[PDB]
Coordinates of C-alpha atoms in Angstrom, one line a residue:
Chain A
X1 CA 0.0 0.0 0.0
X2 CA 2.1 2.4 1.2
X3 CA 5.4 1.3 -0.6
X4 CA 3.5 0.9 -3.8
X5 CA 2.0 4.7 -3.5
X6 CA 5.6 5.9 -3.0
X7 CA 6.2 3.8 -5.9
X8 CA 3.9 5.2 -8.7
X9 CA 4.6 9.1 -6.8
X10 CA 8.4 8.2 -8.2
X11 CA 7.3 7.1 -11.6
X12 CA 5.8 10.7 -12.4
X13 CA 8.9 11.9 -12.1
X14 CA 10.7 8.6 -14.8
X15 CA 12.1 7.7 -11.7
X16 CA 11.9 3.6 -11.1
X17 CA 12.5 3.6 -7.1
X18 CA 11.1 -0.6 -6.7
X19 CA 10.3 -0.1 -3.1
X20 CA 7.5 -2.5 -2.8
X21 CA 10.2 -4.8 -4.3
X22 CA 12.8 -4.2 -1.8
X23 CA 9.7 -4.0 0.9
X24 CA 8.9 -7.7 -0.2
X25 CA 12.7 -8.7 -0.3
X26 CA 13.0 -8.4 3.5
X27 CA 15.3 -5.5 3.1
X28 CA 15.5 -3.4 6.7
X29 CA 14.7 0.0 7.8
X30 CA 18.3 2.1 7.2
X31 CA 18.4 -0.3 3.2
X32 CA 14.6 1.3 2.5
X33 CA 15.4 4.8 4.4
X34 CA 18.9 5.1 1.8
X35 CA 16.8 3.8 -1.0
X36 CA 14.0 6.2 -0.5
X37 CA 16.1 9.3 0.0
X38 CA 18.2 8.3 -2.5
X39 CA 15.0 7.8 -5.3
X40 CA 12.9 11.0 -3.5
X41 CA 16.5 13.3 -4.3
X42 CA 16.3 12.3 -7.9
X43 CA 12.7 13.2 -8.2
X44 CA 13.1 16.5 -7.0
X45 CA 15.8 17.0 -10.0
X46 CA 12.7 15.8 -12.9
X47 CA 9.3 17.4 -10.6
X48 CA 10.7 20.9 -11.1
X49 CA 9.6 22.4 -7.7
X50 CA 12.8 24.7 -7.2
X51 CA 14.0 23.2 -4.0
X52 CA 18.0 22.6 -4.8
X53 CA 18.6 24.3 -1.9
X54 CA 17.4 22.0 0.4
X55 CA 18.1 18.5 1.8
X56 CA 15.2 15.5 1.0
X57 CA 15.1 13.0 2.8
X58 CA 12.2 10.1 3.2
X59 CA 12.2 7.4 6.0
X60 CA 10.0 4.9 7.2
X61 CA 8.0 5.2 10.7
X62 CA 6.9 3.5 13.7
X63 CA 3.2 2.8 12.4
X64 CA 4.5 2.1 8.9
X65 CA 4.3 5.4 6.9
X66 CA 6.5 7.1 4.4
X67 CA 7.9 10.4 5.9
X68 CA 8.9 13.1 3.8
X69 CA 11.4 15.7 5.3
X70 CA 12.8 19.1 3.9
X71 CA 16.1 20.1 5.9
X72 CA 15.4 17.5 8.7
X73 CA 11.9 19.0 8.8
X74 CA 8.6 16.5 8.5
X75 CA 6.7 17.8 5.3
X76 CA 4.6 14.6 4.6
X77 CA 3.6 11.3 4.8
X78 CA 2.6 9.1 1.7
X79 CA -0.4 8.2 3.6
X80 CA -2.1 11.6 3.5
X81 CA -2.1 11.3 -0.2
X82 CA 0.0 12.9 -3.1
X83 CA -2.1 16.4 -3.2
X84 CA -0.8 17.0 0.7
X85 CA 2.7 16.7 -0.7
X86 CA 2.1 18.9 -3.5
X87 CA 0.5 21.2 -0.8
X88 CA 3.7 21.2 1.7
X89 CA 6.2 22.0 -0.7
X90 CA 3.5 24.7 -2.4
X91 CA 4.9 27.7 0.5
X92 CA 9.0 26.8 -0.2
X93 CA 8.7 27.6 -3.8
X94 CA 9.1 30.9 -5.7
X95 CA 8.1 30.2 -9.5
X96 CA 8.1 33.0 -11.5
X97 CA 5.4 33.7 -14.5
X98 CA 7.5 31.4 -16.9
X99 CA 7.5 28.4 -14.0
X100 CA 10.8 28.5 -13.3
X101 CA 12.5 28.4 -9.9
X102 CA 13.4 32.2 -8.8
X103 CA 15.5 30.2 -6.1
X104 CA 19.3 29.7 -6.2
X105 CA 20.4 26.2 -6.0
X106 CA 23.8 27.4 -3.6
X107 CA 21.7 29.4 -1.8
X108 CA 23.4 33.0 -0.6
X109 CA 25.7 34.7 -2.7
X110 CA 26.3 36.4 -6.1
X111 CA 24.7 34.9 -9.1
X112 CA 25.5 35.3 -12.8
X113 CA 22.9 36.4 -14.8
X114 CA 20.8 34.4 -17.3
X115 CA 21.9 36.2 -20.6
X116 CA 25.6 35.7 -19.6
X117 CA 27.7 35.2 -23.1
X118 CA 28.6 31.7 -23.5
X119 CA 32.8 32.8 -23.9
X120 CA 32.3 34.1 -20.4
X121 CA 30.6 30.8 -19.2
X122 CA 33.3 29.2 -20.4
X123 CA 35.5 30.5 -18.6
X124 CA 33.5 30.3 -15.3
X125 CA 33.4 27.0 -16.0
X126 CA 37.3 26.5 -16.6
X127 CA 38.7 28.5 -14.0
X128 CA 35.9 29.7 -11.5
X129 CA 35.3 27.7 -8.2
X130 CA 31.7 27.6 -7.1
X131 CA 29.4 29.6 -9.5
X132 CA 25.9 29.6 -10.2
X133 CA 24.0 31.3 -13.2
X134 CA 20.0 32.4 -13.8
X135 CA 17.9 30.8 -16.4
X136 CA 18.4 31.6 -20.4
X137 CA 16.3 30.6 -23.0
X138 CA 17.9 27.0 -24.3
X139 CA 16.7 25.8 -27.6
X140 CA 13.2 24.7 -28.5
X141 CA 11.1 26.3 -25.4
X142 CA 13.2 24.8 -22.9
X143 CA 15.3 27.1 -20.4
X144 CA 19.0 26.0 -19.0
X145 CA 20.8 27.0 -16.0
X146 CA 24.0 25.8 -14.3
X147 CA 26.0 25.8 -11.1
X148 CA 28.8 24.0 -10.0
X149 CA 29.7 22.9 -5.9
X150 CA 32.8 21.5 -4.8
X151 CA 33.5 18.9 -7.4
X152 CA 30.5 18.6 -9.4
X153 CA 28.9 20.3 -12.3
X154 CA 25.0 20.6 -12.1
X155 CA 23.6 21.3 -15.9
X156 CA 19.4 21.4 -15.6
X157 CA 17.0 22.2 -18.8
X158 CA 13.4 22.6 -18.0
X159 CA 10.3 23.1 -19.8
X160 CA 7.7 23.9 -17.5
X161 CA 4.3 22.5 -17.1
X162 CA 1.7 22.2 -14.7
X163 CA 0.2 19.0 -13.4
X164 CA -3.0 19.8 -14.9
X165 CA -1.7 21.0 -18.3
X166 CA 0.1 17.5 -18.3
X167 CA -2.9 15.9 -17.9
X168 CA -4.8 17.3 -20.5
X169 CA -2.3 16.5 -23.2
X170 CA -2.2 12.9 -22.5
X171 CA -6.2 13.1 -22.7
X172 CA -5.8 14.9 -25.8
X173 CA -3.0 12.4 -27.1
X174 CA -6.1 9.3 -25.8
X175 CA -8.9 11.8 -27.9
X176 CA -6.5 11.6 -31.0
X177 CA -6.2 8.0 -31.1
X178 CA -9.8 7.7 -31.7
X179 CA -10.1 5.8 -34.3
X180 CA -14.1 6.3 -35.1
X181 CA -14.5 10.1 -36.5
X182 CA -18.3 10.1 -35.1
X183 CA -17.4 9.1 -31.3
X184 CA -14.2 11.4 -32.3
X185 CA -16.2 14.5 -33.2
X186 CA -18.2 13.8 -30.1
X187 CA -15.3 13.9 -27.9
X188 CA -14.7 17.4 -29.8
X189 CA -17.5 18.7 -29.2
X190 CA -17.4 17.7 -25.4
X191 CA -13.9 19.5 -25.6
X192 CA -15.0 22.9 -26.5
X193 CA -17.2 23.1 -22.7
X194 CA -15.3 20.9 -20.7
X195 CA -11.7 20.5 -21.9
X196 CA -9.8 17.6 -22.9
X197 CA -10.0 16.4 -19.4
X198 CA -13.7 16.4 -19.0
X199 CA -14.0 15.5 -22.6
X200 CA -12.7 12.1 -21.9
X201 CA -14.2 11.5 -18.8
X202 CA -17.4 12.8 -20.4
X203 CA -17.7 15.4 -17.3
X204 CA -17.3 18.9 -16.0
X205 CA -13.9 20.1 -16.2
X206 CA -13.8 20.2 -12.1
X207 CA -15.8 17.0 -11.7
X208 CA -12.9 15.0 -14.1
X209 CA -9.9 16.8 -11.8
X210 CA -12.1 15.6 -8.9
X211 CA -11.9 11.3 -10.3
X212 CA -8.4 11.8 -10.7
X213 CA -7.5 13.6 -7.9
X214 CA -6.1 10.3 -6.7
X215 CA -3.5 9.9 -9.5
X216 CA 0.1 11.4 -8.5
X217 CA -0.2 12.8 -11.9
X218 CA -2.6 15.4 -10.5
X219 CA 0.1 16.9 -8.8
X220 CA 3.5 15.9 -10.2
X221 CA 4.5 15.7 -13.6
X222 CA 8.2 15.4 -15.4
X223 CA 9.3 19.5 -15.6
X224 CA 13.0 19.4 -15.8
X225 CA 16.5 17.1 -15.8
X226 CA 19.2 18.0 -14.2
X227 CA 22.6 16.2 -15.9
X228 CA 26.1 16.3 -13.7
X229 CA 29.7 16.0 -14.0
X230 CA 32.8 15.2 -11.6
X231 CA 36.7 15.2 -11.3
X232 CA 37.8 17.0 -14.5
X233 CA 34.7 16.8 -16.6
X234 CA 33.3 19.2 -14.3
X235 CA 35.7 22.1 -15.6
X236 CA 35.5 21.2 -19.1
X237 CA 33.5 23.4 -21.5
X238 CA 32.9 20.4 -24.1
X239 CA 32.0 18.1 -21.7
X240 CA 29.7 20.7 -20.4
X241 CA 28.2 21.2 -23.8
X242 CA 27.9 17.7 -24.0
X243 CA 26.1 17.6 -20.5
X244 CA 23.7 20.2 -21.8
X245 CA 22.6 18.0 -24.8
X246 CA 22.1 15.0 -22.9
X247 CA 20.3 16.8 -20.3
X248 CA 17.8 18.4 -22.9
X249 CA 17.5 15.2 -24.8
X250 CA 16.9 13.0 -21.8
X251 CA 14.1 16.2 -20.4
X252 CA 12.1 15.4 -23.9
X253 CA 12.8 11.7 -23.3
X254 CA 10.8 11.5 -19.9
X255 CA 8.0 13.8 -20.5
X256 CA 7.4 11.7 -24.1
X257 CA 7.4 8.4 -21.5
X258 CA 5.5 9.7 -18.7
X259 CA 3.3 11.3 -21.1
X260 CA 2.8 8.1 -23.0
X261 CA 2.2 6.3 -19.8
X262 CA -0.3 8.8 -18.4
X263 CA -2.4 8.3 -21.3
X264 CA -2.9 4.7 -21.1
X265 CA -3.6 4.9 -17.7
X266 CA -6.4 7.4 -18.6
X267 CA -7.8 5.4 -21.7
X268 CA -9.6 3.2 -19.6
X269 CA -11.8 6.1 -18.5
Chain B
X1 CA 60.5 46.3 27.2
X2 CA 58.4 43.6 25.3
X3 CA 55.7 46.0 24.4
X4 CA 58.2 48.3 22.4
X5 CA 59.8 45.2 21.0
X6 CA 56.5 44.6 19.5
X7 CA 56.0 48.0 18.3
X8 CA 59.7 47.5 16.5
X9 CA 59.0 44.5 14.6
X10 CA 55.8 46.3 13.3
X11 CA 57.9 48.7 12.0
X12 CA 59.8 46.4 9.9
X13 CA 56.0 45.8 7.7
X14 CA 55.6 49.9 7.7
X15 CA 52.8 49.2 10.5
X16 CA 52.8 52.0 13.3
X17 CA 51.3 49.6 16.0
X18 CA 51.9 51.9 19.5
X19 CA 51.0 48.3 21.7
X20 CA 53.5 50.6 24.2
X21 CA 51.2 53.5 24.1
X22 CA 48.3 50.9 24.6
X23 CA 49.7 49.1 27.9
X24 CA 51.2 52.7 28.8
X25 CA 47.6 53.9 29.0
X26 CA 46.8 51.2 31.2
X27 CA 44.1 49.2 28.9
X28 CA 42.6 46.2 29.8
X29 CA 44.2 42.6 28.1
X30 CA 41.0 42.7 25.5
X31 CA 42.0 45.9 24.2
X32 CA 46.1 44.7 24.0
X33 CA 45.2 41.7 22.6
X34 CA 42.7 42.9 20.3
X35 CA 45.1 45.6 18.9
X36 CA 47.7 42.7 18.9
X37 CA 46.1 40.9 16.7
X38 CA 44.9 43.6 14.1
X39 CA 48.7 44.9 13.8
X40 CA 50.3 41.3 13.1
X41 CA 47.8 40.5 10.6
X42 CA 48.3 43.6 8.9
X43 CA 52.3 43.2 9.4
X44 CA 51.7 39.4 7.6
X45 CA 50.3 41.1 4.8
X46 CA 53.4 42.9 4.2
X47 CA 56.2 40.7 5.2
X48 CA 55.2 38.3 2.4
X49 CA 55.8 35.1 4.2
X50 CA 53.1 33.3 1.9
X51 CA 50.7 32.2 5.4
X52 CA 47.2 33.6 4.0
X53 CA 45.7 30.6 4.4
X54 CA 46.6 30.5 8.1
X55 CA 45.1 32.5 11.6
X56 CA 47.4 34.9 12.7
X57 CA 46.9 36.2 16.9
X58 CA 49.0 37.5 19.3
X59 CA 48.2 38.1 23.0
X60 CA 49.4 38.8 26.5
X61 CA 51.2 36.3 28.6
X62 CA 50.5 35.8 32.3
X63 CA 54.6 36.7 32.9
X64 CA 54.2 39.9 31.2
X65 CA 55.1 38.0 27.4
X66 CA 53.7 38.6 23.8
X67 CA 52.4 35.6 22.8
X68 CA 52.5 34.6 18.2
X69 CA 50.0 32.0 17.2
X70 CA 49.0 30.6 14.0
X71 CA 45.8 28.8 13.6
X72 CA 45.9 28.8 17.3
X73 CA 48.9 26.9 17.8
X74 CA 51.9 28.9 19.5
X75 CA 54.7 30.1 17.3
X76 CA 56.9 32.1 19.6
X77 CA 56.9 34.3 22.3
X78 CA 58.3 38.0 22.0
X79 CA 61.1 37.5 24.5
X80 CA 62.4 34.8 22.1
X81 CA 63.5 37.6 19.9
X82 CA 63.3 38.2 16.1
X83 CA 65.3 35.4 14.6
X84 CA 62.6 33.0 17.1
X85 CA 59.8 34.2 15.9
X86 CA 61.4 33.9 11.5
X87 CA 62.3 30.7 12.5
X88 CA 59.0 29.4 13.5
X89 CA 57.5 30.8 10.3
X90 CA 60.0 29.0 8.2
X91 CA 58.9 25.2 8.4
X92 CA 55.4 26.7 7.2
X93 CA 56.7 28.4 4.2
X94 CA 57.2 27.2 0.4
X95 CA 58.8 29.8 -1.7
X96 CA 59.5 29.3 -5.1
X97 CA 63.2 29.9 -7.0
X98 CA 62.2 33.6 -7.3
X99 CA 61.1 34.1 -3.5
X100 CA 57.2 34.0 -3.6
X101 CA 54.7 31.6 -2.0
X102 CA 53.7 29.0 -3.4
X103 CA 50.5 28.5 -1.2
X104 CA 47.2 29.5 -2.5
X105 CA 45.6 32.2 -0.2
X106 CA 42.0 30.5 -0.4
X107 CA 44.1 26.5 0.6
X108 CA 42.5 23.7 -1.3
X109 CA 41.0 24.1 -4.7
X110 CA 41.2 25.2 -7.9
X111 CA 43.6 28.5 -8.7
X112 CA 43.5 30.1 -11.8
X113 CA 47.3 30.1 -13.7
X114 CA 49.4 33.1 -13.4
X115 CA 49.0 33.7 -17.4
X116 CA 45.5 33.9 -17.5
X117 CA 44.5 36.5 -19.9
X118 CA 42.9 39.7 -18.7
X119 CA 39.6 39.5 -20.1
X120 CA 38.8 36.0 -18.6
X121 CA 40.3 37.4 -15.1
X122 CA 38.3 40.1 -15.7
X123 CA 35.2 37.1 -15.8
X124 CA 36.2 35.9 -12.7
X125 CA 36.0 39.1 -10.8
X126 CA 32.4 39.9 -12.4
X127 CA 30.9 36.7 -12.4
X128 CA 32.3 34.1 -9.9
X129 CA 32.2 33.6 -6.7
X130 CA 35.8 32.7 -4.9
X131 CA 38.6 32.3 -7.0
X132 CA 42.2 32.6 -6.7
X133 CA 45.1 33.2 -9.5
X134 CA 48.3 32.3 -9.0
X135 CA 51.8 34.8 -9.1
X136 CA 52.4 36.9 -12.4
X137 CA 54.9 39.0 -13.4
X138 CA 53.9 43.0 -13.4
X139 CA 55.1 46.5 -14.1
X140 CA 59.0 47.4 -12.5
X141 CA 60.3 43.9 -11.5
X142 CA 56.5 43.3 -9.5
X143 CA 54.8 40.5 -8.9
X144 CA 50.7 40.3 -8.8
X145 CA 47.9 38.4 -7.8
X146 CA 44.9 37.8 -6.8
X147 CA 42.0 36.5 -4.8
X148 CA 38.2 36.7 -3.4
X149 CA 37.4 35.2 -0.1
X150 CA 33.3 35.3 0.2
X151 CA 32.4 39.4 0.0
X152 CA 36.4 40.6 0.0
X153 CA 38.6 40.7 -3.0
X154 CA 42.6 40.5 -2.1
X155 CA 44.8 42.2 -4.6
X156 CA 48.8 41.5 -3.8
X157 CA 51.5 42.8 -4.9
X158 CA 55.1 41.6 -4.2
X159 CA 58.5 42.3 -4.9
X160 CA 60.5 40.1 -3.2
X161 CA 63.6 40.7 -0.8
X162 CA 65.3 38.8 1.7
X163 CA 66.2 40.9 4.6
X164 CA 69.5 40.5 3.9
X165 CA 69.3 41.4 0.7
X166 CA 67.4 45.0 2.1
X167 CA 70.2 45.3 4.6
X168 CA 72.8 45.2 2.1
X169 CA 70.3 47.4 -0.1
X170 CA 70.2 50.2 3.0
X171 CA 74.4 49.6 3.5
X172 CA 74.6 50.9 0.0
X173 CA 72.3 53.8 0.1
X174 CA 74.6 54.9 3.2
X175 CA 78.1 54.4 1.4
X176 CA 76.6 56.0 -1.5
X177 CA 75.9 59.2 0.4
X178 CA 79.3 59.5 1.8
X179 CA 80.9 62.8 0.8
X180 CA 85.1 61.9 1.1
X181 CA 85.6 59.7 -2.2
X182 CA 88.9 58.3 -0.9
X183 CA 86.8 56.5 2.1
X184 CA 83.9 55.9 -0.1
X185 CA 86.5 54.0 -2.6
X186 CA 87.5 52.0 0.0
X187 CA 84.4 51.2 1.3
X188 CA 83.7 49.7 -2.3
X189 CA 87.2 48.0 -2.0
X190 CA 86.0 46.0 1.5
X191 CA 82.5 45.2 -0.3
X192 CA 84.2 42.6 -2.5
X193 CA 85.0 40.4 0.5
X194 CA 82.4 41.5 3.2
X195 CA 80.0 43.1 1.4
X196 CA 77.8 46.6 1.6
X197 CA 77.1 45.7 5.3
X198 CA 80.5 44.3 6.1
X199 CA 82.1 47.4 4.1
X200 CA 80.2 49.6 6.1
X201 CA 80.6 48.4 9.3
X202 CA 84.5 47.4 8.7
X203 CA 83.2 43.7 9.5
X204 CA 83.4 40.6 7.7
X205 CA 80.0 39.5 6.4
X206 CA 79.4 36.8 9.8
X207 CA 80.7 39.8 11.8
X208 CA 78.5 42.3 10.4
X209 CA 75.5 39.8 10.9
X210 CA 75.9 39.1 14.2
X211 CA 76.6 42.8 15.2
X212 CA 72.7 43.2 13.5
X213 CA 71.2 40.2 14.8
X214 CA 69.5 42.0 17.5
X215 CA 67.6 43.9 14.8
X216 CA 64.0 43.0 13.5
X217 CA 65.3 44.0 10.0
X218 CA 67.8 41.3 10.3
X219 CA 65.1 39.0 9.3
X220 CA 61.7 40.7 8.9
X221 CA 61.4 43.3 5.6
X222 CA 58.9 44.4 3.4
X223 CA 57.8 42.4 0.5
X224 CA 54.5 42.9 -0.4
X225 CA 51.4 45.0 -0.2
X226 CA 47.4 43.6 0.1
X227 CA 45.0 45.9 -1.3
X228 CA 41.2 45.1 -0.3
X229 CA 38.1 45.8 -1.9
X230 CA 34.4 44.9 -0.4
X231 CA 30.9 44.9 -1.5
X232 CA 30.3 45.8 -5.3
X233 CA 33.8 47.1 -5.8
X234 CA 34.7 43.3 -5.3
X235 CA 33.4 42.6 -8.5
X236 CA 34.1 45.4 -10.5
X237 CA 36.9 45.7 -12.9
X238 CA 37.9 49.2 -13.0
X239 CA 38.0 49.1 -8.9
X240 CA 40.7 46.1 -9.6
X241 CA 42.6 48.0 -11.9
X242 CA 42.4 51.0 -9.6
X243 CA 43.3 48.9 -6.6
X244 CA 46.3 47.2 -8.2
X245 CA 47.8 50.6 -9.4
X246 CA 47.4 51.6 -5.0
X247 CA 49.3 48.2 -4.0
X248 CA 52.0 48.9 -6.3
X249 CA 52.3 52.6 -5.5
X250 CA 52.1 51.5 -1.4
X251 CA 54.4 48.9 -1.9
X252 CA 57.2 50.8 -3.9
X253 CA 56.4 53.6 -1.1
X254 CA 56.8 51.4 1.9
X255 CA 60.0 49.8 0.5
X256 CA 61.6 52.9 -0.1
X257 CA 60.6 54.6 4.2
X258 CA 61.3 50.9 5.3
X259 CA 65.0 51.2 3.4
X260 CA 65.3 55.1 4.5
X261 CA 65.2 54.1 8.3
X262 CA 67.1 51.2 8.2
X263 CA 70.0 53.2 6.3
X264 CA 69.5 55.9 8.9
X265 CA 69.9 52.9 11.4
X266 CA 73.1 51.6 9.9
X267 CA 74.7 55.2 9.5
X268 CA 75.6 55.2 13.3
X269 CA 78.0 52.1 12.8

């Protein structure tokens, strides 16, 4: 129950954490504490929420919950559902009207600026210690930032989205599939009141966000990926382009699978 | 006695320290200690020893002693005398062929070469955060660098000198000044043997050593000079450029008083 919720919140974010498995493998409490921290970190580099800055950590308790902690602090357990999460981390954000994170990911100090010219980037990145730039536009609607601490290179491209807006493109991606143009056209027409959503589920727009208000996907969805390097590859400016394409190609990877998976889930509605 | 010791071997780094004002005034151990402190660090920034990355304090004794630590351990004690107190520096030192440290100011980490060109330094001090370059060669026989420790930018400039090396420096300036060209001839005749201090003093070289060794300048001088910038003049260019012209211009200034007193020390031998 609650290892398989924690589960399918992890797979929102492409993230395959198999904590039911090691739950059912008679693994103990510090093996599924690391293993949840450890899949619960990597989430919060594809969810998007902004929250570098601070330490996750998820543990199991006494009366067999999930806990969810910010900076040693309790935000959540998996047993109050995935919209109580969403709801905790809502007040630690700062999203600006574009989606993006107005929060630093080292926290205090000076920051370079988004439109910074690549030449100078370079050589922040060759000969700088710990640095940090703002977003920039990156190519195809995405937006890139980067920061380096200690010994590793942190490279993220997002492309915002909400969780609702996620939502209704996999129920428009199940709507296009239709194969008969009369239920098709029907589904259309629904569309033009209700949404995509609604559409689907052959509902109001609020009543459809209601019967899925259950699915993680209602809250979470794939908005970023955040690609690193170590040793010397974190002070070298092709490996960092390099970092940059496999982070934006490995962003459109996830939100095409979650996406796709999202949608076959809601078919059978 | 060891108050106006301490006020003598701040005078060898240009530093006008008055601790024998201070304890004459009757203040408290705080305010000795405190003022202590704040002249040897300033002194260390001068005497070019290469121990940035290291705590500098001094403080009262119970006997009545000045007490030199670094990073908290003791070094020497005042009544040790001079040549204590160089010695105990030594083992913490690594100067390179040409006399200048070869530890980074920030410790470990990554320091930018001494050749780096001016526009990417000029990267650095806009846009990172710290950073460190190591020793390059400047205007009149100078050496520069530079550094940024969290909201303080360190600009040094050194021309090395061993106090020998100023002693015999401050030997000439006197046997140049000397009026009778018969004496001043022969002065020049002894200096091939015994050197400018052994010339001057009718010594040979060990003899002239030892007759000094009861002098700071025997083995303290002044080698360097640390300009600092804070807030937004840390990262801006034109206050760099504006603070590496004033180190220069204080150390060429400080070398020549330091050299002036000491030649007006050695004229009475």
């Amino acid at each position: 129950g609650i290892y398989a919720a924690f589960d399918t919140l992890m797979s929102t974010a492409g993230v395959d954490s198999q904590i039911a498995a090691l739950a059912a493998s008679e693994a103990d409490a510090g093996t599924l504490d690391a293993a949840l921290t450890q899949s619960l970190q990597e989430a919060q580099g594809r969810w998007g929420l902004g929250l570098h800055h601070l330490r996750h950590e998820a543990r199991l308790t006494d009366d067999g919950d999930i806990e969810i902690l910010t900076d040693g602090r309790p935000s959540a357990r998996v047993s109050e559902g995935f919209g109580a999460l969403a709801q905790a981390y809502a007040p630690m954000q700062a999203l600006d009207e574009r989606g993006l994170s107005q929060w630093a990911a080292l926290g205090e100090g000076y920051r370079a600026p988004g439109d910074l010219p690549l030449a100078q980037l370079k050589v922040l990145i060759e000969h700088a210690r710990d640095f940090e730039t703002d977003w920039s536009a990156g190519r195809g609607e995405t937006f890139q930032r980067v920061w380096r601490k200690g010994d590793t290179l942190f490279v993220e491209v997002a492309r915002p989205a909400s969780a609702e807006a996620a939502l209704s493109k996999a129920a428009w991606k199940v709507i296009a599939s239709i194969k008969d143009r009369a239920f098709q056209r029907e589904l259309m027409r629904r569309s033009e009141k209700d949404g995509m959503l609604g559409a689907l589920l052959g509902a109001r727009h609020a009543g459809a966000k209601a019967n899925l208000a259950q699915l993680p996907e209602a809250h979470f969805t794939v908005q970023a990926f955040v690609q690193t390097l170590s040793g010397a590859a974190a002070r070298n400016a092709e490996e960092y382009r390099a970092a940059l394409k496999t982070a934006a190609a490995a962003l459109e990877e996830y939100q095409g699978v979650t996406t796709r998976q999202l949608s076959e889930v809601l078919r059978h509605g």
